[PDB]
Amino acid sequence: RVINRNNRLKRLIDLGAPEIIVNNEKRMLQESVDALFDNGRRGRPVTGP
Amino acid sequence: DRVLRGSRLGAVSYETDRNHDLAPRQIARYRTDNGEEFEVPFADDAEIPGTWLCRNGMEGTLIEGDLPEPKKVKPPRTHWDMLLERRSIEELEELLKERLELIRSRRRG
Amino acid sequence: EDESEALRQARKDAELTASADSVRAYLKQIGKVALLNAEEEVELAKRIEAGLYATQLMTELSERGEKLPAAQRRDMMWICRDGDRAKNHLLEANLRLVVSLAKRYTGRGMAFLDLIQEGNLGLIRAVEKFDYTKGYKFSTYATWWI
Amino acid sequence: DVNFFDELRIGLATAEDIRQWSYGEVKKPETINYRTLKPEKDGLFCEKI
Amino acid sequence: VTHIWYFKGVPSRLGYLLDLAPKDLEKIIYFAAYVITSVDEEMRHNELSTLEAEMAVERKAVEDQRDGELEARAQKLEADLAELEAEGAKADARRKVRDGGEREMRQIRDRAQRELDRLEDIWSTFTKLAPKQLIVDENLYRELVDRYGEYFTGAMGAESIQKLIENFDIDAEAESLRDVIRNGKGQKKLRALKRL
Amino acid sequence: FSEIMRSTLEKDNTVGTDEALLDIYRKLRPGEPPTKESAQTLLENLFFK
């Protein structure tokens, strides 16, 4: 999840994207790192199957 | 049902862990763009590559100043490419004139 | 009750909430800019293609080229920036189309915001390769790329 | 980690510590080629990294 | 990207280091609200006078529009006179158009008054602008940036938190807290200990 | 007869049925633009629909 969202952010910044999409992607990156260090801490815990 | 047992995808060999002689080997020095140095031990009879992906992760070239001219590829496809392959220059220039006289007739009246 | 100020003040105070669901935060973000119509799309696409031709011609005349006139250079850079404004405006316009197409592919495989962002990237590709002279509504052509 | 110990000093880590710990930069969201069952290059299991 | 342990777990450590509330720091690092990370002092100190002159020019142009409204509906209201008291009609239906244009001016002066209140708010914010402040309400931040684009830098999110940690003397801040526990009392002294 | 009910009726601090409906909606849609047809129906949603 972190690698996908980071690569998507990198291609969005390289391609030139409006501010809404880039800030949404950075919020998704933040939530991915937050789930990596502590899932279930802030908000809904990231579920599996 | 069965069993449980599992294996890492890889073999575990066991030989003599000798240290007295080995295959002799060189040390090459690669360099990134931002002044980072990295040393890579290659074997002696080994064609040393000019560029090498370093421990930092960016592409690093060798400290020997040969520069073998890698002939970096074209930009893949641009918005200018996707526009030009479906229109023409006189049409785009016509629209350029239309916006030019549009901002003209906006500005000075 | 439209007026007085209390019934709308409650709406403004409800607009500034936390809403820790990032999905709902993104929807409250994208509900801001207004949806468009066909003549507006034609106008936007003409502005975008004009700005792209302007920056191509400016790069061509920049190399080996011209001491440009001040008015002509100033407003061709105006066109160059206005094209990008129109591009970002159309992207913002059809974000909601992206959400409405990606809403039915949830429930399996991936999350929801990842699907939204991939639809947005497809929407960028569609607004790059959109033609208007075929005379169609934009959603018909963009749905394929999304 | 031979058994000679006097201290165990934790500390908040910096980015110049983190990219000095590493031996590579993982940059693809791939683990194992589905057909040969060998690890991918620049993935989460790359033998180079 | 901010680390989660120094942000979320109570007591928050970014909050005590930067003197920010967690209820409002979550609005920063999750891209919900802007934060002012720097401001120019002396440029605000003299272009405060120049920009309040420009503000007076702007609100006078607003009042040019507003007495255009007054004069135009005054002319349309004397047209209401000349088409309500010039024929055969009912005594109240001839003045329903009188109440109509007057209610129009009431809601129109409400329009002009609310946008003048918006301009007064954005002027008060640019006067009282400071680092470690939060500009909520996106429209106000966008208007504030593209009219006053110099004089300050202000971003949103973890890179802005990083910029604040870059621009942070810990020593004078620490000695200020030492001075507060040297002299303060009550709630301030307890929070000064908990940040010290 | 109910002294507590007449006491809370005197401490009602809101007159108007829709003026109660909006409070209502704000407390149950915190993060939503209210309108009269929504709070008319969403209270009927949770308990009657």
TrEMBL record, chain F:
It comes from the Bacteria. Transmembrane segments: none annotated. Belongs to the RNA polymerase beta chain family. DNA-dependent RNA polymerase catalyzes the transcription of DNA into RNA using the four ribonucleoside triphosphates as substrates. The RNAP catalytic core consists of 2 alpha, 1 beta, 1 beta' and 1 omega subunit. When a sigma factor is associated with the core the holoenzyme is formed, which can initiate transcription. This is DNA-directed RNA polymerase subunit beta. The lineage of its organism: Bacteria, Bacillati, Actinomycetota, Actinomycetes, Mycobacteriales. The gene is rpoB. The chain holds residues 248 to 296 of 1172 of the full protein.
